[PDB]
Amino acid sequence: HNKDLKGLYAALLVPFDENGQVNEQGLKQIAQNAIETEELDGLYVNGSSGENFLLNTEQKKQVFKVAKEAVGDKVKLIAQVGSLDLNEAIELGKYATELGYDALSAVTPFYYPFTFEEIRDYYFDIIEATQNNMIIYAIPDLTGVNISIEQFSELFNHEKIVGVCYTAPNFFLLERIRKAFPDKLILSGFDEMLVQATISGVDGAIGSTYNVNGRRARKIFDLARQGQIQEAYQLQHDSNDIIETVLSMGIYPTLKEILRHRGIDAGLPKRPFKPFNEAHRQTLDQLIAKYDL
Amino acid sequence: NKDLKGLYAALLVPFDENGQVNEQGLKQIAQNAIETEELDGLYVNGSSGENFLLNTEQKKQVFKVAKEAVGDKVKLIAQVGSLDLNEAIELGKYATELGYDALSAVTPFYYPFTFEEIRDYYFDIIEATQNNMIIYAIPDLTGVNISIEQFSELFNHEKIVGVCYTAPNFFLLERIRKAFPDKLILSGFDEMLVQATISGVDGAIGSTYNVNGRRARKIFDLARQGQIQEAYQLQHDSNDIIETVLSMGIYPTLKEILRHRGIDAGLPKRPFKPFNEAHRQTLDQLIAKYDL
Amino acid sequence: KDLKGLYAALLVPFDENGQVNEQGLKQIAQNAIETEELDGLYVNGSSGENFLLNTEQKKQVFKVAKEAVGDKVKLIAQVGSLDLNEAIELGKYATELGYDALSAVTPFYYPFTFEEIRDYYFDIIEATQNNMIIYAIPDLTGVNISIEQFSELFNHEKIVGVCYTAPNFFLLERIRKAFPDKLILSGFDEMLVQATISGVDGAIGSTYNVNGRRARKIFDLARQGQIQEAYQLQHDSNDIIETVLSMGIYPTLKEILRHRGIDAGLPKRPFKPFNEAHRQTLDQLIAKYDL
Amino acid sequence: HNKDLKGLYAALLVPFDENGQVNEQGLKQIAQNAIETEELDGLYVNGSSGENFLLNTEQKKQVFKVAKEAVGDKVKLIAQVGSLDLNEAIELGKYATELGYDALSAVTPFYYPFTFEEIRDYYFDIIEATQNNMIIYAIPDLTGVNISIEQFSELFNHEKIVGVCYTAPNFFLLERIRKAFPDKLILSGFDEMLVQATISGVDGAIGSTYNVNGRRARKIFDLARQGQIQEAYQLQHDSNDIIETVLSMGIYPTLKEILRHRGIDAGLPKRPFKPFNEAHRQTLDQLIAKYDL
């Protein structure tokens, strides 16, 4: 049953106004873009890419509400509810669950040097008070937390921890996890290594660049699994041009600018993130023309 | 207009089973710091207060309780930094209106913010609050490191009055002391208080000063009176204590030490786990050896 | 020759005094070619306990390895050292023996600047007149090479490729795209399948000393779009790799070789010998995978 | 009557010709400068600052012999013999002991991920083969290896592991080591932190900058020990101006430029180290003038 949530997901980006308030109308357009135009399977809501950790609780609910209203019932929805405030995490978990989100996910607790048992019981406490399926959100590069195979075994021993959004750049640890946990869901989080993740047996992927590059991403995934490896990899080359450029210019503002070119009310990033820098505008215009973004 | 020199307690916070502030116990913790531990001031809503686990209303609640529990002679610094800048500004306005002497803010963490993004977070808070600001630098929790050149650009701001410096680098500390002779430097590593003091710091903020403030003042005073042999010996003893408390879970364990004095020390906030009782004996041995 | 293909990072057997066992070394060399069916030997790399050796022992390893195998066998000589004089002496020595290319570890320990790293490669090249492969092993050296820095290095016509051990598939893909005509040999045995689909030209590995047949099928199947089969042999191969790493890779690999009648000797101290408390577990692995 | 090993040591620099060969006459001058001009207690020979890890065995012996023959019989001499090749370490350990060196030291084995028991028996094997006293050479910034308090206790259990050259930036660990081992020799290795090391109870120090700045170093050490801490710290301010400058310029070639300025044939660095960059000359001359180097 744990493979229900397989597929490609947009890590939903969020447009803000000048005071860091959610632009609800552009958000509806970003959600719709990712399903109708980028033809993806679902939305990963209030993750790192949605600037989620800059938000207050009310804004997070506001994003959850608008994202679900914006899509049809066939669209898969994962609610990222992890927070350093466990009371908040539970509140948001109950909220997203009552709305009908298919699964929750939660960042590994960060900032403080939490012990593994403290990290473990954080997942267990959210599960118990929300009774929803849970996906571990592992982004070592943001959290400084690393999860070993032994720790994954303890976590995966809970029947409601159904899988992981996996972001460690380690394809040895990825393969071991894949072999050790054949029935759990693994969605990879490194857009720039989608093809390698695909051939390592991932069940899908969650990505910020799929908001603008979701159709090449689906081909990478499909071609690689049909053993069209050369063709899959050439698409990874193209995708990585996109990813590398968008990374050099500031990822979330730049992605939202590509969506603006599509006529989306892409608003602004939430301070302390700065708005897209115009010194980049022409290189970005070149990229958009080159890859038809 | 107080100078902000001296020794501060990084205020610990007692919670109930639900993660709610025990207001009664917190008032006790605050007064212990001032009355028993003879400290110059309180550093409020910092990492040791379990601040990053709290909601906005709880942070305000801690600020108000702390301020009400202390006299006017007491120096107060309000840590208002948050990944949500609107919240930081909200909290900055609130603590300022309560009469806190300065704000401080943690360097923005999690996301790989550029330095210019970090700088304008400090500038934006100052300019909505008009209070003096202290850079809260804890590379070990934030993963952010500030260079001499970057302190130079920040200290150029009239309202950035100094730094809470919890980096372990004594070359960098010396360079900063020399480069910025009229800025405030408070050290944040309790276990290197004696090296900090002889490196010319203006004072210190620490969580162990909640239980070991008498020795900490002696290290501070003795090292400056050049009675360094004796100041370092107290550092050996302090560091015995810091070592033990760290191995036991520092915040729960410090509040367990405070329980022993009849303080309503409550719980840590989940996901922090409470004091493990397997440690109870060794802790009793420590409280006993060091008269804690 | 073209230098594409699968190479054994040649292991070296020692006596109790850390002297090279030349008969054992011959048998290891021949085992890699005849039994493991590999294309070449990568000689005096990290896996050969090279950085524990003296200069005359390194010369000894180069001579014995070349003499052990036939003319069709591809031979790469790692001559990099913190001692550039030694690096040059060794590069000349291996070039004179007829090694196909030289390779050289990024200078480490001292915080060399890039320009100092770059001219170390250029200085070895000038003195030897042989083709050079960058030996990039950040986990042992602590040195990382940027795409920018690879570009500067690859401008040199005699810097012909890279033995690539960084566990970073974004950087690997960048390099492959930027340098379609350079030779990329991957260094991580446990990620051969990901490396192969990222378009590497071959691989250098210590575990290929005992698992070269499976490695070849990983390589070949992945390139034929037989991607599930290739991945399955990666699972199998990674069981082996994980086990051997947990026991102490060099002495354990040489212990698997000793099970074939090879005089695999001892590791060089400060490396300790294979620990007997691992023997049953290792025997079970050998049985499981027919090693 | 064997020597008390307390005091201030120059980390001996080595001058090279255009082919990376030792200049013995310059080397003798550098050695005598450290004792007679800089008034230091001892030489630490064939450490990192002597560019030792760039040398062949015959060169290392050249250096041991010349440094020994340059100085009087009261001059303290510590021989760094550690190597990735244990056979070489043993050989040099014997060579240096036969020369009359007061102690050996040995870098923690590096490059390969040796277990700690492997590291330990590396020291115990050198000791057994040489029967001289041994100093742990801990330079984590170069070796990438860290020794914990518990690891120190096990090494220090050996009667012939007599102390540590502690070139490691951690003052909490330094204090623990000091507290646990009142019977062991601690020489600190960070010049820029000599005042902090002094008040933390070290027995002395080994430094490359003491080749040009040993007179200030001694006042820092002596003053701080006598409680005159503000004067000591002011000299740390001054000394760190020199150290920061010399680090910015390329430390070994620059220190050797400073010595060339006093009439010493300080030669060249050994490649891959590049020579002093002339673009730094004016800044260097300004430093020499300011502090009378």
Residue numbers in the entry:
A (entry chain B), D (entry chain A): 1 to 293
B (entry chain C): 2 to 293
C (entry chain D): 3 to 293
Question: What does the primary publication say about this deposited structure?
Answer:
NAL catalyses the reversible aldol condensation of N-acetylmannosamine with pyruvate to yield the sialic acid, N-acetylneuraminic acid (Neu5Ac). NAL is a class I aldolase, functioning through the formation of an enzyme–pyruvate Schiff base formed with Lys165 which carries out a nucleophilic attack on the aldehyde carbon of the open-chain form of the N-acetylmannosamine. Here, using the NAL from Staphylococcus aureus, we demonstrate quantitative conversion of a cysteine residue, site-specifically into the nonproteogenic amino acid γ-thialysine, chosen as a mimic of the natural catalytic lysine residue at position 165, using the double alkylation-elimination method and that high yields of an active, modified NAL can be purified. We then characterise the resulting enzyme activity, analyse the pH-dependency of catalysis and use X-ray crystallography to investigate the structural basis of the changes brought about by modifying the enzyme.
A mutant nanA gene encoding the K165C S. aureus NAL was created using site-directed mutagenesis and DNA sequencing confirmed the presence of the mutation. The structure of the K165C variant showed no significant changes in the overall structure of the protein compared with the wild-type enzyme (RMSD over all Cα atoms=0.34 Å). However, the observed electron density for residue 165 did not extend far enough for a lysine residue and was better fitted by a cysteine residue as expected. Interestingly, the K165C structure more closely resembled the enzyme–pyruvate complexes than the apo structures since the loop region (138–146), not generally resolved in apo structures, could be clearly seen in the structure of the K165C variant and the side chain of Tyr137 was also positioned more similarly to that in the pyruvate complexes. Calculation of side-chain solvent accessibility for the K165C variant showed that the cysteine is inaccessible explaining the need to unfold the protein prior to chemical modification. Despite soaking K165C crystals with up to 100 mm pyruvate, we were never able to observe electron density for substrate in the enzyme active site. Experiments demonstrated that the cysteine side chain in the native protein was inaccessible to the reagent 2,5-dibromo-1,6-hexadiamide used to generate the dehydroalanine residue. Nevertheless, replacement of the natural lysine side chain with a thialysine residue is still consistent with activity and the rate of the reaction is enhanced 360-fold when compared with the inactive K165C variant.
